[PDB]
Write an enzyme that holds these catalytic residues in place. Sequence first.
Site, PDB file in Angstrom:
ATOM      1  N   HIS A  57       0.676  -1.114   0.007  1.00  0.00           N
ATOM      2  CA  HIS A  57       0.052   0.013   0.076  1.00  0.00           C
ATOM      3  C   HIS A  57       0.991   1.280   0.053  1.00  0.00           C
ATOM      4  O   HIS A  57       0.372   2.406  -0.154  1.00  0.00           O
ATOM      5  CB  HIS A  57      -0.899   0.108   1.391  1.00  0.00           C
ATOM      6  CG  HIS A  57      -0.357   0.563   2.484  1.00  0.00           C
ATOM      7  ND1 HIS A  57       0.232  -0.473   3.237  1.00  0.00           N
ATOM      8  CD2 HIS A  57      -0.285   1.623   3.053  1.00  0.00           C
ATOM      9  CE1 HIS A  57       0.662   0.012   4.245  1.00  0.00           C
ATOM     10  NE2 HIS A  57       0.338   1.513   4.137  1.00  0.00           N
ATOM     11  N   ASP A 102      -0.112  -7.488   1.990  1.00  0.00           N
ATOM     12  CA  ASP A 102       0.314  -6.219   1.766  1.00  0.00           C
ATOM     13  C   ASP A 102       1.824  -6.148   1.875  1.00  0.00           C
ATOM     14  O   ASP A 102       2.535  -5.761   2.808  1.00  0.00           O
ATOM     15  CB  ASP A 102      -0.108  -5.325   2.796  1.00  0.00           C
ATOM     16  CG  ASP A 102       0.062  -3.729   2.781  1.00  0.00           C
ATOM     17  OD1 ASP A 102       0.529  -3.329   1.569  1.00  0.00           O
ATOM     18  OD2 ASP A 102      -0.015  -2.978   3.616  1.00  0.00           O
ATOM     19  N   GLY A 189       5.902   2.963  13.800  1.00  0.00           N
ATOM     20  CA  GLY A 189       6.196   2.292  12.648  1.00  0.00           C
ATOM     21  C   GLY A 189       5.686   3.015  11.406  1.00  0.00           C
ATOM     22  O   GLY A 189       4.582   3.271  11.290  1.00  0.00           O
ATOM     23  N   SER A 191       4.415   2.945   7.514  1.00  0.00           N
ATOM     24  CA  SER A 191       4.176   2.112   6.579  1.00  0.00           C
ATOM     25  C   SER A 191       5.012   1.564   6.076  1.00  0.00           C
ATOM     26  O   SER A 191       5.940   2.155   5.590  1.00  0.00           O
ATOM     27  CB  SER A 191       2.999   2.820   5.574  1.00  0.00           C
ATOM     28  OG  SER A 191       1.697   3.167   6.140  1.00  0.00           O
ATOM     29  N   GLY A 192       5.034  -0.112   5.875  1.00  0.00           N
ATOM     30  CA  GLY A 192       6.051  -0.757   5.308  1.00  0.00           C
ATOM     31  C   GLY A 192       7.167  -0.911   6.156  1.00  0.00           C
ATOM     32  O   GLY A 192       7.944  -1.764   5.823  1.00  0.00           O
TER      33      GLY A 192
END
Lengths: 241, 241
Positions: A57, A102, A189, A191-192
């Site tokens: 995403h 994801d 955190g 994203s990713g």
Amino acid sequence: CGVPAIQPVLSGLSRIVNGEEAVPGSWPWQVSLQDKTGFHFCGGSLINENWVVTAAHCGVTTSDVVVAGEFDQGSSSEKIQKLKIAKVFKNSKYNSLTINNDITLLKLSTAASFSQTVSAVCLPSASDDFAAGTTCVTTGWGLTRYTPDRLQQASLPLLSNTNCKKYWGTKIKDAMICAGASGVSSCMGDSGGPLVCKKNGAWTLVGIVSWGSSTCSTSTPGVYARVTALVNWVQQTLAAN
Amino acid sequence: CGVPAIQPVLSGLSRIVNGEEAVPGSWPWQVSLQDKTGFHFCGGSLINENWVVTAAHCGVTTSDVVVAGEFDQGSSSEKIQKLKIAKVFKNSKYNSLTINNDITLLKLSTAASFSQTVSAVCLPSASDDFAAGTTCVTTGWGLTRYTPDRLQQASLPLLSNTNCKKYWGTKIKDAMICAGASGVSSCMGDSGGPLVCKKNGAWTLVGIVSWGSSTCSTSTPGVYARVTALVNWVQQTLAAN
């Protein structure tokens, strides 16, 4: 893999509120994903000198850049490597509505040069069991979306998917794993970014940040792509490319 | 463009709660984006027989499918066209963190066959002024993310970006436009779905669904990619491809 040359220091403050600042360089697989202009929008993890794993995403393209070896995003003085992306491999099972599966792999145009502050996280095997209640660690600059500019870390427990559904309901799929709801936010955190657990002296990538509490609640767990469910696809992708 | 062969019927119920059901076929540019398995995950708008415009955050790939002419997703009996995607053109200025410049073009492998129920929305010119307070319409199957399986519609007013920031703060960029907060939800809009306004007898695409209230609040406006800010890129892309 999974053995930082600069060992992490995790105190009791990593377990409450919004975690704590990491020791510089102690999470050496942690990378920053930036656009052409240098704007940080996601995290990721080096799995070797040529490959970074992140969330699908994030929508990374070959005009984005991987930045390795970073600690303070506000510093222009630390040794970093800005690495071009040759090709992006999004997992074909990714669904932008459910955010399941994801995971995306980035192949670098030129290898990172591994060092004390730049090296790879270990990948689990598909059959590894990371039991509910295991204390794991998430790292990143995610608090900058809302504030410290230096890399943060938090220690938080894995949940069973059944208990995670008490918070997130039918959003939780088999290829997801949750952590937190223990008095610390998951919002540091990116994203990713990585969720790592230490087995047999080595840090192993168990999760990739998918989403968390919209208010960074200390009693709502983060949701992560479950790497054990996706590592076979990772290894097939590396072998074919 | 912008003149449906089956004219829309918009009643007072389109202005409250969650809007109302559309007349079948009366929004003929409305398409459904589905994965290989037929799972609907986003909306989009036909702008000619070869091109669909949607949101960049939908993350569409060439293995997804455009479905045109649909009214009832629960029906297997209506005339639809399942159209393969040849190539995906994501706006290079899209940023998955800010969700700004949230537009992607899909080029179909084979042209749609236009009909009474399948035809194109008009695009604005870059210099068109769609004033705050103008009543516009959003359509889609977005309520199915939370429930009616047939296409819904709601009438809602455009906001000024200054007033939109009272709700969404610094999330609102120049390439975004907001609508709603008038007693009706924006949640019937699928991600990537249309926000259309009627000028001079023709419906024109003013917005593309980017995000809305997480609780589908009737007093929180939806946020859309501002098509006037992106239509020059659209026309350059069509001309070059």
